[PDB]
Write a protein that binds this ligand. Structure first.
Ligand SMILES: Cc1n[nH]c2ccc(-c3cncc(OC[C@@H](N)Cc4ccc(Br)cc4)c3)cc12
Lengths: 20, 336
């Protein structure tokens, strides 16, 4: 499931902002 | 509305032109606890000793803002923040600076981040998500009217207050711009294709970001995700979205419009402006007046147990405040 696919991933926590 | 915003432009303009400075000292506050952290600073629960009030003080290291080439952006932040005034934006109460850092003492929003609840809860029901959308809809309608672009919409930047309402924080990429702009800014998951495609952009990126928000709220995960940002950018520019089977048809069609790669076909960017959204089928039950007044039934109310209660925020290691004997980046920040 997409949900499963999402929880197993590297970006489930707080996402940082892209500067340079 | 048009009348409202009309009066609104005038107070912002006055403020825009004569931005305020140094409204306090460090030693008037009692440092209590880090509520968030970032590339060049941390936000702290702080207590004003004279009033016994609590605020969130943002502490920017001057040297690190310089190393990361973020001077203009930092300047935009304080200037735009002290100038705006809306029910869904956090209030900047003070600002000052010392030899070592820059400070912005804002209002302590007790409810915690939207991110936190949504992660724990999983996904929001359409009605709960819509409650929150409507609030970003008006907020953008206000923001854009002042020729501002927000540029950093994500659950991490939206806080819930005592009444279950939204409080948009972090105006580190906010910019007053008439015409196109070019900085690669934001969070990967929320970038509009034009931005990743280095093609100059306008406000339309704020409506694509909203389209992403609503999606992550109602389904529990972003419409485009992968392990590394390059993989995400690839998805964003592909213009291929799959919708969860539990999405209503009205929601699927609001989202098709908001997440339009063709920005001459994207809602919010069209002829009728923000009304295309405010008049969409999904929103047919929303009382925008009642919502602006905070007279709507808030679907969820994070309850907290008293002032200074920080149980809706994650724990962070405490770094100690160090203030140099030597003023650090004087010229670069003189207008702060
Ligand atoms: C809690 C809280 N209560 N009252 C607030 C008013 C503003 C803010 C706020 C102000 N700038 C940015 C923000 O961002 C948060 C999050 N993106 C993580 C992050 C962390 C530290 C840096 Br510095 C930058 C990013 C949040 C928080 C509170």
């Amino acid at each position: 499931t997409t949900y499963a696919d999402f929880i197993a991933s590297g970006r489930t926590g707080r996402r940082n902002a892209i500067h340079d | 509305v048009k009348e409202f915003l009309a009066k609104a432009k005038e107070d912002f303009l006055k403020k825009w032109e004569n931005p305020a400075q140094n409204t306090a000292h460090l030693d008037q506050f009692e440092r209590i606890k880090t509520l968030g952290t970032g590339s060049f600073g941390r936000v702290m629960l702080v207590k004003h000793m004279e009033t016994g009030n609590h605020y969130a003080m943002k502490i920017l290291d001057k040297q690190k803002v310089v190393k990361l080439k973020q001077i203009e952006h930092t300047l935009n932040e304080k200037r735009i923040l002290q100038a705006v005034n809306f029910p869904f934006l956090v209030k900047l109460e003070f600002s000052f600076k010392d030899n070592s850092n820059l400070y912005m003492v804002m209002e302590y929003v007790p409810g915690g981040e939207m991110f936190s609840h949504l992660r724990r809860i999983g996904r929001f029901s359409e009605p709960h998500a819509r409650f929150y959308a409507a609030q970003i809809v008006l907020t953008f309608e206000y923001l854009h009217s002042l020729d501002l672009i927000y540029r950093d919409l994500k659950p991490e930047n939206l806080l819930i207050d005592q009444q279950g309402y939204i409080q948009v924080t972090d105006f580190g990429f906010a910019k007053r711009v008439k015409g196109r702009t070019w900085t690669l800014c934001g969070t990967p998951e929320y970038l509009a294709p034009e931005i990743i495609l280095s093609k100059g952009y306008n406000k339309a990126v704020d409506w694509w970001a909203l389209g992403v928000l609503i999606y992550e709220m109602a389904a529990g995960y972003p419409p485009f995700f992968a392990d590394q940002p390059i993989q995400i950018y690839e998805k964003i520019v592909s213009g291929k979205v799959r919708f969860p089977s539990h999405f209503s048809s009205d929601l699927k069609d609001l989202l098709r419009n908001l997440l339009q790669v063709d920005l001459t076909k994207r809602f919010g960017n069209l002829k009728d402006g923000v009304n295309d959204i405010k008049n969409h089928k999904w929103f047919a039950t929303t009382d925008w007046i009642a919502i602006y007044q905070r007279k709507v039934e808030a679907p969820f109310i994070p309850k907290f147990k008293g002032p200074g209660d920080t149980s809706n925020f994650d724990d962070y290691e405490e770094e100690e405040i160090r203030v140099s004997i030597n003023e650090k980046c004087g010229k670069e920040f003189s207008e702060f």
